[PDB]
Amino acid sequence: EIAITHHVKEGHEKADPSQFELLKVLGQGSFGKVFLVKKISGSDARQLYAMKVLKKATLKVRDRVRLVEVNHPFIVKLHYAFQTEGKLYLILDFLRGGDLFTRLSKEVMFTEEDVKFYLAELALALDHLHSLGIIYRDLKPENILLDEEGHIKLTDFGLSKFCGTVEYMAPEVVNRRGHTQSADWWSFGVLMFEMLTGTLPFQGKDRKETMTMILKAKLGMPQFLSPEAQSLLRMLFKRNPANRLGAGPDGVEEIKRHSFFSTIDWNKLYRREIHPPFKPAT
């Protein structure tokens, strides 16, 4: 089954099926049957929202560690999530022409230039969520979508099939001894390894072997990677969170300054003025 971890706001109230009304039901391809709905009550009243009605899904509601609400360019958000009549209702941002990053990953290979773009946008998104009080623990390519123009859309909610995907979990999470937002920047590195190498840095036949690798393995640096990418992976794949890039006070700035992202104008990127490497069909 699917496990949706909803990082709700403090004070944000639950929703009911009657509180929204259906305008169109469409197929967003891999998003499946998406119901387009508009709210009747609250601040969001009159807002179009995608609705997914899932039958085999478990809702965990983790509050944010922690005012002005804002739409980040590279994040889609779960606004409401209610289990009614044995069905899980998810009210999310409408992502017209959206697709899965896992689709592109299988069909085409990315240059390091391609990985820079998507990872740069993902880092902005991840830091925005960290600034919102959300620690991901299990950030994974399944949590990464793409909009109609090709820009990254990170889910602000967890998606797992604490059920998470061990392969993307930092040592301190795996240890079940404590973690901070720095655990997510390790996973960022795991993503980078898989994007750039096509394989996972830590993978065994079972979760115990995969866990052991995370905790104890010594990895050969793929030498086809650029020196900048090698350095970033070396600095993000540090088992002591205090020695990890992105664990200091400036957070993502430690990563945004790394030589690998030296070609990114992070201001242009946020303004969606850097054009994505692959453009979805339209």
């Binding site: 040592p171 301190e172 240890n175 001894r177 840095p201 905790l215 104890k216 393995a217 010594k218 990895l219 050969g220 640096m221 090698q230 992976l233 070396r234 794949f237 540090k238 088992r239 002591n240 020695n243």
Partner: peptide, 10 residues
């Protein structure tokens, strides 16, 4: 922890 902070080999 008490683990090899560096994961990639030297």
């Amino acid at each position: 922890e008490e683990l090899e902070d560096d994961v990639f080999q030297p």
